[PDB]
Amino acid sequence: HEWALADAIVRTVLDYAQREGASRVKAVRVVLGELQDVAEDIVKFAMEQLFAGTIAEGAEIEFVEEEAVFKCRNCNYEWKLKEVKDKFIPEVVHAFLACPKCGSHDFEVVKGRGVYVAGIKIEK
Amino acid sequence: YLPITVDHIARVGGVEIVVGDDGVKEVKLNIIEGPRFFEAITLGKKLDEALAIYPRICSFCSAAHKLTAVEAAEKAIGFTPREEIQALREVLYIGDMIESHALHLYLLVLPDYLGYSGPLHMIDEYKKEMSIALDLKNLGSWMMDELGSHQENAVLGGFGKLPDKSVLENMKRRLKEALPKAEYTFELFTKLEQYEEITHIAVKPRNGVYGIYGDYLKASDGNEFPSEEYREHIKEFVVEFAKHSHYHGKPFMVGAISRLVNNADTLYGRAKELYESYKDLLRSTNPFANNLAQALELVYFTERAIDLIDEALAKWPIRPRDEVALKDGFGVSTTEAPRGVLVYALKVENGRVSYADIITPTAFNLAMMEQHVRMMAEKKLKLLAEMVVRAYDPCISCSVHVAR
Lengths: 124, 404
Ligand SMILES: [Zn+2]
What we know:
heterodimer; A: 6 strands; 27% helix; B: alpha+beta; zinc (chain A); nickel (chain A)
């Protein structure tokens, strides 16, 4: 969910600011995996609302999308989601997607599953 | 700026209750999200576009949102729709009511009492109940598909398109055929236990809207002391989560029981006789009665629909009128959704949305949902709490029990 994820982001950012003894936070850059089905606008808005009434208020939030990369183990071949997209895409791939080369369905997600904060701007 | 990596742990709606050796310690729930986002984005957008955006909120009641939205818009611009198109709107709405109620009651409430899990179609039982549920679902969805097209047919000032009279006659026939099924539903839900799977019976203010012959559409609030259109208090309590609402300073409940309690005398037809027969069962002090109440509303809304259909035939040729957008219109439409009273508030300026406030019935029901967790048991308690929750018919839910 958008609001839950946004809550996680806000909590983490505020925690980092507390640890660093930050007087104020001004900018946060978050990297979202495209396998997340969340909508960037809702998440950003939610973050803005939760950011109210704290040191990290009125902060500028930037979202960077990390492409999804899959590595089939059997043939040992890597491909990207964009290659399969050309024919919602994100959720629960394991069900439908397989390697373009193998009849396998067995693969590991290397990039694009997780969400992490890549940058934080602190004012002390 | 300075790059870092801090991982966001999202192991991951639901209701959480924490219990102890000394008794229950805490109970809180975050089951729905604020519509604030929509209220924020539609500002400055065209009225049509906003009306297209609004039904995205709580998609389960897809139809209702659209209808109340356009109602609010019309009330803003000063347009008052004809009685025929209004009746048709109420018919589509009735379809949504039938679908929502039937699906909810049968697919959610019955397996709880009879203890079923997994696939809900089985030989040894439930064939007939599912036949009824599926027939009602098909009927409502078919009405929604015939008078709606999200609802593309629902437009400001009228309808996009309107079908032939033949399909309306066939609709009347199908409704009349659907009446005894709804009756069987009411009878079936009459026998099941209320206030228990530990009675949760207590004092509870119910809130509804009042319409002269029915409870579908209205322009007046329906509690013990009525108001035409007013903003009740709203409170922001966070688990750590939507905003809760308090009427007259206290939590209140909305749903079928509210319509019955407040507007009982307005009913007629078979549902009136049934209400008079089992008036004790649909009492104002219990949540589970809502389920049964919903069943009653099936029969009523079935028969009512027929009447409404006839009203549409009072004028044999029908055409969707056109309206002009006007500034300064502020329109507050308090409608009644299968979940409860749905509130839409639209202020239009220069043909664009200047103010939007939307309140979903589940927001209303959430305070009393938190209140009515006076369920004491030793785990099975999860199941009971789940039943209590499902009595309020939220969009989705799940229960988690935790010790210490
Ligand atoms: Zn392969």
